[PDB]
């Protein structure tokens, strides 16, 4: 009789709970499980953050979960309450689909990995594009929130230690008339513009930029995924280039990959000595899981090369490395794939890019 080791999940639907179950079942078939054997314990998102925190205690930690997978729900409800409660005990949380950069902050989320990259990591792709198409002078426009500044930090790290940013402009999130900011950009000789902004803020930029005739020939616009989604698409200038994280929204793919990684890490953990069990339930328990920090190190340095979403590794912040993006180009108002970033390399496909103007 093997030792039962529970994995937790908070997931969007019962369909995905069943997928979690079957993934754990496959992990048990795949692995040698005479000594340790995984058990799936799962729950769907609660309708508010307090209920969610409580459920983590009542439904998951009461089963002594070694780790908790967490999907971002579609249709105000973030992983945060799960990260907080799990973090209390140093139980690792694995984000499946959350892209916000704030979850890379160790002070706030001190046992959090994710199998998708933060939006800010789109700068990695921008940078390779800037080499490829030899844009050596760019203007960077970012929203003055955490996400915008995260993108700036990331690009400037890549640049400031080739191509250079000739200026960086920040604007206040929710500003509608951005003519002041964009005239400042119009002044400069660089005509490659990179944008980090939310859907609605990108809309505002696009509109103003059009009024100032900065969306026509000679200009290049380079953005990420948010800035060609929903309403942002509606007013985006033609010839724009943006990104889509491949499988970024496929909860089933990421459940499958995350379970594989966690299963591997669990079996690796139990090769070592003096592994303690997590606390059983929240009530009465205020000490951390002593082995939590060790398990985190093991997860952090896990490699799963043959993942559904590609090559799974994690960086210093526990963020996904070797993520793959579709490179998208707005042509006659259709988003058309003109290539992919395959994790380390830009691969252009046979569809020709059309720039602003042409």
């Amino acid at each position: 009789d093997p030792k039962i080791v529970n994995i937790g999940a908070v997931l969007s639907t019962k369909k995905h709970e069943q997928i979690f179950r079957e993934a754990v079942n496959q992990a048990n078939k795949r692995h040698f499980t005479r000594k340790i054997q995984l058990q799936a314990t799962s729950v769907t998102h609660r309708p508010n953050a307090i209920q969610m925190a409580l459920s983590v205690c009542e439904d998951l930690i009461s089963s002594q979960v070694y780790a908790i997978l967490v999907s971002h729900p579609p249709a105000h409800l973030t992983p945060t309450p799960i990260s907080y409660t799990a973090g209390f005990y140093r139980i690792p949380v694995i984000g499946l689909t959350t892209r916000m950069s704030i979850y890379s902050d160790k002070s706030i989320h001190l046992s959090f990995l994710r199998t998708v990259p933060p939006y800010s990591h789109q700068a990695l792709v921008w940078f390779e594009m800037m080499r490829l198409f030899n844009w050596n002078h760019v203007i960077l426009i970012v929203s003055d929130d955490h996400e915008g500044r995260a993108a700036q930090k990331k690009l400037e790290t890549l640049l400031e230690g080739g191509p250079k940013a000739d200026k960086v402009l920040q604007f206040e999130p929710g500003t509608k008339n951005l003519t002041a900011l964009l005239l400042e950009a119009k002044e400069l000789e660089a005509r490659v513009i990179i944008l980090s902004a939310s859907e609605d803020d990108a809309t505002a930029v696009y509109k103003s930029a059009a009024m100032l005739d900065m969306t026509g020939a000679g200009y290049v616009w380079l953005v990420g995924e948010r800035e060609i989604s929903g309403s942002a698409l509606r007013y985006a200038p033609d010839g724009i280039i943006g990104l889509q994280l491949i499988n970024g929204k496929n909860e089933s793919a990421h459940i499958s990959d995350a379970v594989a990684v966690v299963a591997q890490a669990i079996h690796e953990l139990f090769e070592m000595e003096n592994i303690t069990d997590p606390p059983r339930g929240c009530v009465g328990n205020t000490n951390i899981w002593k082995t939590g920090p060790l398990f985190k190190r093991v997860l952090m340095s896990s490699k799963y090369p043959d993942g559904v979403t590609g090559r799974i590794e994690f960086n210093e912040d526990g963020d996904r490395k070797f993520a793959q993006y579709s490179i998208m180009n707005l042509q006659n108002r259709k988003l058309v794939q003109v290539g992919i970033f395959n994790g380390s390399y830009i691969i252009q496909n046979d569809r020709k890019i059309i720039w602003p103007g042409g």
């Binding site: 309708p47 508010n48 953050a49 307090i50 209920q51 925190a53 409580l54 205690c57 009542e58 105000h76 309450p81 907080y84 409660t85 209390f88 140093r90 160790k106 002070s107 706030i108 001190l110 046992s111 339930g281 929240c282 009530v283 009465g284 328990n285 205020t286 920090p293 060790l294 985190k296 190190r297 952090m300």
Partner: protein, 363 residues
């Protein structure tokens, strides 16, 4: 005059009786509104116990605000309380213990306020101590515990803006979210030369950092460590690994007793509600539950905050910072002596430091 409900929550053994009796200034409100105080006892300080307890209160009674005291060294209690405060938009005062341990970066819509000094005030107290004794050469060690940036930045901002001959030699950042089987933190600490080391972390984190620091010879004579209030924590609990000669800034009821704190907490919440009622002819309706907060959110706000931070009562300014700390706390500088007892060796009052010793005796 109408009654507002205030829960006072007491974790761990407490003179409930001395507490009730200090609030006999209950004949003490000549305001538009009067408090209806209910002492609740609580035994546990995990997230579930704390959440369910306050939520049960809120649904079995109309709570305008919470006054919270505990007898633990658990800084996470502050975080849980901020979370609860923000989600339910209910004023919470953490007046003692873990609840009062610095919570940096409170939620935008938190109504959570703590007795005790800000991070930046403590940082500046530390530099005043150092300036007194001409300890101008020092290093910093922190973990990733929230505040550590505000700490380091405050030091750096102060010393870069001053003509005193500060030399900040080394700033270490210790990651204690990973295990230490590769002796990483040992190798980081080995890098320390300075005779003064400022340490920002939690009490439990310091317990480990000190153990390691000792192993590589950094806690003896020649090295003086200075820590903030939350490391010393409860001064009747002194971990064996804490080095004698440890200096702390402290706030742990030396002259400000729990009874007096509970009285002031009740007063702050009550004055604040009276002030709002007098100006807007309403106050915020106590939340009927935690379990319906998603619905009721357009109907709720942190309006009451602007009054909560600007209370004077019985002649004393009980202002909070908007960052959620007491504005003018009387701080006590303390020293861990040869008998492993924490010992008063200075006061910080009126932005002025008064130290006991001109020269530090051996301990």
């Amino acid at each position: 005059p109408p009654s507002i409900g205030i829960a006072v929550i007491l974790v761990g053994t407490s003179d409930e009786v001395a507490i009730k009796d200090a609030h006999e200034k209950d004949d003490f409100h000549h305001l538009s509104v009067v408090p209806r105080v209910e002492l609740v006892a609580m035994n546990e300080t995990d997230p579930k116990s704390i959440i369910t307890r306050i939520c049960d209160l809120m649904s079995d009674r109309k709570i305008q605000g919470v006054v919270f005291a505990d007898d633990t060294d658990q800084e996470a209690i502050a975080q849980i309380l901020d979370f609860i405060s923000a989600q339910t938009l209910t004023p919470i005062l953490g007046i003692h213990g873990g609840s009062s341990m610095i919570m940096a970066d409170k939620d935008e819509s938190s109504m959570f306020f703590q007795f005790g000094p800000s991070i930046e005030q403590q940082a500046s107290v530390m530099l005043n101590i150092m300036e007194e004794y001409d300890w101008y050469i020092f290093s910093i060690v922190t973990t990733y515990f929230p505040g550590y940036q505000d700490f380091v930045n405050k030091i750096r901002s102060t010393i870069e803006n001053s003509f005193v001959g500060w030399e900040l030699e080394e700033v270490l950042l210790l990651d204690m979210s990973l295990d230490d089987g590769d002796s990483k933190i040992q190798n980081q600490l080995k890098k320390l030369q300075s005779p003064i080391i400022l340490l920002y972390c939690t009490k439990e984190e310091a317990t480990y950092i000190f153990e390691v620091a000792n192993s590589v010879g950094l806690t003896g004579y020649g090295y003086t460590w200075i820590v903030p209030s939350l490391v010393a924590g409860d001064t009747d609990t002194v971990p064996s690994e804490f080095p004698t000669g440890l200096i702390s800034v402290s706030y742990d009821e030396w002259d400000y007793g729990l009874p007096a704190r509970v009285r002031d907490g009740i007063a702050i919440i009550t004055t604040a509600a009276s002030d709002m009622l007098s100006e807007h002819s309403f106050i915020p309706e106590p939340k009927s539950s935690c379990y319906n907060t998603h619905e009721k959110r357009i109907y709720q706000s942190n309006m009451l905050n602007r009054y909560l931070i600007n209370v004077t009562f019985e002649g004393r300014d009980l202002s909070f910072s908007e960052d959620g700390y007491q504005m003018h706390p009387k701080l006590v500088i303390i020293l861990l002596n040869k008998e492993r007892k924490w010992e008063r060796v200075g006061k910080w009052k009126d932005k002025s430091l008064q130290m006991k010793y001109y020269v530090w005796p051996r301990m």
